[PDB]
Amino acid sequence: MEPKRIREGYLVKKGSVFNTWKPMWVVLLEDGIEFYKKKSDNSPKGMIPLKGSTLTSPCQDFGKRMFVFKITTTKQQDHFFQAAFLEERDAWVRDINKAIKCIEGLEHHHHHH
């Protein structure tokens, strides 16, 4: 009903506290991926620009355990987060990287004339 995001779920993201790794709620939207702690902590912990982010798969030595990839928002903001399994690892990183690669071609204001 109210909830209207492209791909929302709950994965652990490392970026907000003192360098750690804890599960969290995150919703990638077609205009930006904003994630909080629960389906709606009511206050987002950090957002991701849907244009200028990178993807690292595999990732670096930051976990490299189950399925943890590393993204780099145009603001040099690394994002090492792991899903619950491979299917959710490529489905989450592909949905966030897809929306970011889709906004680069989804602009408005046409100047045909």
Structural tokens at position 1: 């009903």
Q: Where are the domains of the chain?
A: 1-113
Are β-strands 22-29 and 7-14 bridged in parallel, bridged antiparallel, or unpaired? antiparallel
- Burial tier of 13 (Cβ tally within 10 Å: 0-12, 13-18, 19+): buried
Distance (Å, whole) CA 38 – CA 15: 16
| Cα 112 off chain centre by | 34
Half-sphere exposure of 3 (CA within 13 A, CB side): 13
Distance (Å, whole) CA 66 – CA 84: 8
Distance (Å, whole) CA 111 – CA 43: 38
Classified by CATH at the fold level, domain 1-113 comes out as: PH-domain like (2.30.29)
* Locus of tokens 């090492």: 80
| Cα 72 off chain centre by | 10
Note whether 16 and 22 are within 8 A (CB).
no
Structural tokens at position 29: 């939207």
Note whether 68 and 50 are within 8 A (CB).
no
